[PDB]
Structures are given as structure tokens and as C-alpha cells.
């Protein structure tokens with residue numbers, strides 16, 4: 001009838017695994033009901049229309065002269081901005097334009113209470129936010145993309161390569177980095193990578209597009225593990241599979257090949273494709289968009305992994321997080337396609353520095369800070385729910401008792 | 407009045 | 417876990433030497449004292465009116481009978497009749513005070529939170545106790561149960577290195593502090609040490625110890641006690657004179673404080689229970705179930721004090737009502753029998769608490785007599801002085 005010191009440990013395991021399963025189910029429960037809305041949110045926002053702002057000042061202005069003030073949901077807003085003020089637009093392919101606009105709009109709409117910009121002395125003071133191969137020493141103050149014409153064939157500097165980066169920090173994420181590069185021969189790339197902070201146990205997000213004369217030659221998207229076992233959490237795998245069923249249906253499964261450098265980082269559900277026609281490209285685009293949005297909405301509810309003194313389990317977990325992040329970091333710079341693209345034009349002495357400080361830098365002792373601006377949520381709130389100052393109440397009771405005379 | 411963009415719905 | 421796994425024969429002879437009815441088995445780390453709440457049937461958390469009204473009106477009737485008996489012969493009674501009435505009234509008030517301590521943790525009548533908070537405040541008032549400070553201190557106890565340097569709202573034991581530090585800090589055992597410690601932990605006044613706990617409430621009467629969004633509630637909590645000792649305590653004296661005060665108030669007060677102090681002291685002190693500092697081997701479920709004791713009462717006293725000795729059935733289930741505390745224990749022995757610890761009312765147990773178990777040593781991880789400990793740390797002073805002559 002009584003129990004033994006071994007089944008009570010069985011009981012604690014029962015309870016804790018049940019709780020883990022419960023939270024993992026709660027994560028996916030929201031996506032499960034309608035997955036098509038992970039891509040179709042913009043069209044719905046457009047359908048519902050403009051909203052009429054009703055603050056006391058807005059109503060007063062509207063009743064004095066004539067003016068109606070309108071607002072829009074953040075999805076419609078990030079579709080009017082587009083590839084807004086990138087300096088290298090107008091030479092970027094329309095597919096890369098679509099993808100960059102969507103990704104950065106997601107970052108701006110979902111993480112808008114902690115999204116800082118990465119510390120400027122790391123990347124933006126050296127001048128790595130806009131890089132030209134005809135002006136590596138930056139003596140044209142960063143207008144080389146306009147002052148210098150394109151070299152002709154066989155001339156010194158052919159083929160010309162130019163890069164544009166953007167880097168952000170946040171609460172959960174220690175680096176959200178997007179980068180677009182163009183070469184003169186007709187090659188365009190796009191490289192996105194989202195890194196969580198060392199104290200969190202989440203997988204890294206990554207996306208690459210590489211297209212040649214308007215034809216996508218390589219498109220890879222991966223929510224890549226961080227553990228030594230290379231298996232994600234139940235919600236990550238469940239979401240990737242549900243999304244592949246929703247968007248990649250009717251598509252060649254034998255196309256998601258594993259490259260020689262892939263299985264060392266690839267989650268079993270990672271995608272690597274060389275699209276054939278418009279259908280493959282449209283399906284892949286919708287799928288990558290929905291996957292990125294899901295990854296962010298899942299991070300929205302994350303809790304740090306804290307190692308209390310006396311608990312070694314969490315210390316080992318944090319060590320594992322460090323190993324996985326660094327493994328991915330030095331395993332990505334051996335994607336020597338883009339690295340040789342860079343080193344054939346910019347040299348090697350500049351490339352080592354730029355790559356080791358920005359591209360896939362790893363510094364467990366260094367994660368930047370962030371700026372918590374959630375109090376603004378209060379101000380905006382109290383602009384649609386104002387309270388007036390103890391004298392308007394007498395007057396309003398007067399008005400109510402007066403009009404109700406009828 | 408034209409799009410000139412690219413969307414996966416043609 | 418101090419005298420853990422070894423043949424049960426020596427643990428039984430230890431239990432007979434100490435008056436204990438049992439000594440616990442081995443408990444492994446990594447558990448939560450809320451685990452074993454999954455065992456109890458889903459009817460042990462039930463609500464019913466008759467049991468609660470009995471639990472509140474029976475010790476009330478005891479107190480009322482005692483007062484009526486006294487006021488019948490107000491001051492012409494002899495000494496031991498007075499002692500009998502004082503003991504009876506103090507026991508009735510200990511029962512009413514356990515009802516109070518129930519409604520303080522919100523598990524008496526969760527149907528009416530306001531009425532039950534008012535009841536707890538009203539019933540705590542005559543003993544000069546503030547409901548919210550009591551609730552804070554009791555949760556702070558539950559969280560640090562049997563932890564060293566951390567649970568000061570329980571029976572924090574006095575250790576060895578600190579007593580040597582005070583020995584050097586006073587320049588011998590002849591200062592006021594050492595004499596006070598000796599006289600308080602050696603004579604039966606220890607059985608009333610809960611009085612000191614009552615002086616450690618009113619945390620300097622200082623709101624700087626609390627959370628600002630709670631100020632207006634803490635002050636009202638200090639109001640019902642003060643108001644009492646500002647309104648009723650005069651009236652009594654006015655209508656009874658000094659003696660008439662030492663009779664109808666002070667003696668039931670000392671009775672209730674005796675009951676409180678002995679309940680706690682015997683519930684969480686024993687030689688087979690170590691006091692570890694966390695980081696140096698502490699655990700929640702271990703120091704909860706393994707480092708505890710449950711005491712036995714006669715069923716008259718158990719219906720009077722309102723199950724005042726069952727502290728574990730409501731430490732595994734903080735939301736377990738009061739009329740179900742024995743029944744739940746019936747289940748627990750069915751499951752964790754070997755690890756439980758039990759004891760009974762015996763003047764031998766109290767005498768060993770008074771004379772034998774006085775100072776806690778962390779080396780042997782057990783309690784020792786104070787005169788032997790004091791002579792031996794005087795001997796260690798001789799040792800360090802011998803190392804200091806050169």
C-alpha cells in the first residue's frame with residue numbers, strides 16, 4: 001500500500017511532463033483553428049477598411065470644421081511603406097522587395113514595444129550599413145551608389161557588388177539581421193537570420209534567397225534547432241508540419257534536399273528548394289511568410305530559462321544553448337557561396353573583419369541591451385478612454401435632465 | 407494606378 | 417532527514433527514548449509538498465454548514481461556561497478553581513483562534529470572503545493579533561519551512577557558531593544577553609516563548625516593511641487590536657480593579673499563548689530533524705514532510721481546539737478545510753506511512769524539550785543540552801586561547 005523512493009520520482013516526472021505537454025499544446029492551439037490567416041492577414045485588414053479615430057480632440061476638430069481623421073491597422077500601414085527608404089531600392093528584384101517588406105513589417109508590428117536598433121558603434125559607424133566595391137574606403141561619404149557609374153566589361157572593378165544591411169535588437173532576440181546584396185552580372189541575394197538571446201531556449205530562424213536574372217536559383221528556409229539532439233520542441237515541429245500541409249500542398253516533396261552542410265543545422269522539416277515555375281515560387285513565398293510570422297507570435301510568450309543557485313539542470317541547459325548557437329554561427333560562415341561573393345570583390349582583410357563582427361559574430365559575454373517602451377500603451381489607451389475633470393459631470397447631468405424633458 | 411509590384415496571387 | 421536509513425530497531429528505541437510514536441523513513445530530493453494532494457478524494461475539499469458552526473460555537477460555549485462559573489463567584493474562589501476556569505477559557509479561545517487562523521488563509525468559508533475576513537479580524541482582536549501580518553508571516557513560514565537563517569517566523573533554533581560569536585562579543589557568559597538566553601531556553605517559561613513572537617508582530621509599527629498598494633489594509637489590520645486594547649481593556653479594569661484584570665483577561669491570555677507555543681514547538685522540533693541552509697542541502701518536500709511531527713490529543717481536546725494539531729494535512733493541501741483535517745490524515749498514513757513522524761502528549765517530551773534539546777549543533781545536526789554545550793564551548797575558548805598564548 002505505501003510507496004517507495006522510486007515511484008515518487010516517477011510521480012514528479014509524470015507531473016512535469018504533463019505540464020510541459022499542456023503548455024506546448026497551448027502554444028499551437030491558436031494557429032490550429034485557422035492557418036490560412038498566417039499569410040492572409042493583410043487582405044483581411046484591407047477588407048475591413050479605414051477606422052474612424054474618436055478621441056475628444058478628433059471629434060472636436062471634426063465638428064468645428066469638417067475634418068475626419070482615419071487610422072489603419074499596422075498590416076495595412078507596413079504595406080503602404082513597402083521597401084520604404086532603403087537606399088538600394090529601384091535595383092532590387094520584385095520578389096526580394098516583397099520578402100523584405102513583409103519581414104520587416106512583421107518585426108515592426110509584432111515586436112513594437114522593445115525593438116531597439118542595434119548599437120551604432122558596432123556596425124553603422126564603420127559604415128557597414130551600405131557597402132560598395134568601387135569605394136571601399138568611403139571617401140564619397142556614402143553616396144558612391146550615385147556618384148560613380150557602372151564599370152564596363154573588362155574594366156577595373158567589374159563586376160561591381162553592393163550590400164545593404166539592417167540590424168535590430170529586442171527583448172527576446174539579440175540580433176535580427178536583414179541584408180540585401182546586388183552584383184553587376186545579374187545576381188541578387190537576400191539573407192535573413194533571427195537569433196534569440198542566450199537565456200532563452202528557442203531555435204534560430206533563417207532564410208536565404210538567391211536569384212539570377214529574375215529566376216530564383218536557390219530558396220532555403222529553416223527554423224533550425226539549438227540543442228545537441230537536433231529536435232525542436234513539439235510546438236515548433238507541429239507548426240512547421242501544419243504549415244507545410246497548408247501551403248506546400250501539391251508540391252514536389254523530393255525537392256527539399258539536404259545539402260552537405262545542411263543536416264548539421266537542419267531541422268528534419270527544413271526546406272531547401274530550387275523552384276521551377278510561378279506556382280512553386282508563390283507557394284514557397286506564402287509558406288516562408290507564414291512560418292516567420294508564426295515563429296514571432298510564438299516568441300511573444302516566451303519565458304527565460306533561469307539557473308537558480310542549487311540547480312545544475314538549468315546550468316547545463318544554458319551551456320547547451322550556448323553550444324548550439326555557436327555551432328550554428330561558425331557553421332553558417334562556411335556557406336562559402338556568399339562569402340566568396342564577398343571576398344572576390346572586397347578582398348579578404350576587409351571580409352574577415354566585416355564577417356567576424358557582424359555576419360555571424362558570436363560573443364556569449366556580449367548581448368546588447370534593449371529599450372522597454374510599453375508605458376506608451378497606457379497613453380494611447382487613455383486617448384480613447386479619457387476622464388474629464390469633475391466639472392463636466394455636473395454639466396452632463398444638466399444636459400441629460402434637460403433633453404429628457406421631452 | 408498600376409501595381410508594378412509582385413504578389414504570389416498574380 | 418538526520419537519523420535516516422538504518423534498522424528500524426534503533427529508530428524505535430530512539431522513539432521510545434524521546435517519547436516519539438514513530439521515526440520517519442528516507443525521503444529523496446526533488447519533490448513538491450503539493451504533490452501528495454493528488455491522492456486525497458475529491459470530497460475531502462467539501463463545504464458544509466453544521467461542522468463549521470460547531471467548530472465556532474463549541475469553544476465559544478466552553479469560554480461562556482467558564483466565565484459564567486467565574487462571575488458566579490467572581491473573586492471568592494480559591495486559587496486552583498481560578499486556574500481551572502482560566503485553563504478552560506484559554507482552551508476555548510485557542511479553538512476560536514484556530515477558526516481565525518483558518519479564515520486568515522481564506523479556506524474557512526470561501527463563499528463569503530468579506531464576512532470571513534471580518535470574522536477573522538474580530539476573533540483575532542481579543543488576543544491582540546493583526547490578521548494581515550499574521551497571514552504574511554505564515555506564508556513566509558510555509559515558504560522557508562525548516563530552512564536555516566530564513567524561517568524566523570517559526571521556531572528558529574539557536575546554533576553554535578553564533579553562540580560562540582556572542583560569547584566573544586559579550587566578553588564572557590556574564591552579560592545580560594547570555595543570562596537572558598539561558599533563563600529563557602532552560603525553564604518552563606520557554607513553553608510561553610510565543611509571547612515574544614507577539615512582540616515581533618507590529619514590525620516596529622512601520623509601513624516601510626510592506627508594499628505601498630497595501631498600506632490602507634495593513635493599518636486597518638493594526639486598528640482592531642489597538643482599538644480593543646484602547647476600549648475594552650480599560651472598561652474591564654474600571655469595573656474589576658487590578659485583581660479583577662489578572663483574573664478575567666490575563667490568565668486566559670497566558671493559557672492561549674501556552675497552547676500556541678507548545679503546538680508549534682512540538683510540531684517542528686525534534687532531534688531527528690536537521691536544519692540545513694539552502695544551497696547546503698535543502699528541499700521543499702523533504703523539509704516539509706520528513707522534518708515534521710504530528711501530535712495526538714484526546715477527542716474532547718480535538719473537538720475543542722478544532723483539530724489544532726493537524727498541521728501536515730494542510731501543508732500538503734493549503735486549501736483543505738478544517739473539519740476534514742483528521743480524515744485526510746487517515747489517507748496520508750495509507751501512502752507515506754514509513755516517512756511520517758508522530759508523538760503524543762507527555763510531560764516527558766516537554767521535559768526533554770526543556771532540559772535535553774536546547775542548543776542545535778550543525779556538526780552532529782541535532783539538539784544538545786545547554787550546560788554541556790556552554791561548558792564545551794568554554795573549553796573550545798580554552799583551546800583557541802591555548803593557540804593564542806604564543
Ligand SMILES: CC(C)CCC[C@@H](C)[C@H]1CC[C@H]2[C@@H]3CC=C4C[C@@H](OC(=O)CCC(=O)O)CC[C@]4(C)[C@H]3CC[C@]12C
Nearest residue numbers: 544614615616617618619620621622641642645646649
Ligand atoms: C498595555 C497593554 C495592556 C495594552 C496593549 C499594548 C500593546 C498594543 C503594546 C504594548 C507593547 C508594545 C510594543 C513594544 C515594543 C515595540 C517596538 C517599538 O519599535 C521599535 O522599537 C522600533 C525598532 C527598534 O527600535 O529597533 C514599537 C512597536 C512595538 C512592537 C510595540 C507595539 C505596541 C505594543 C504591542
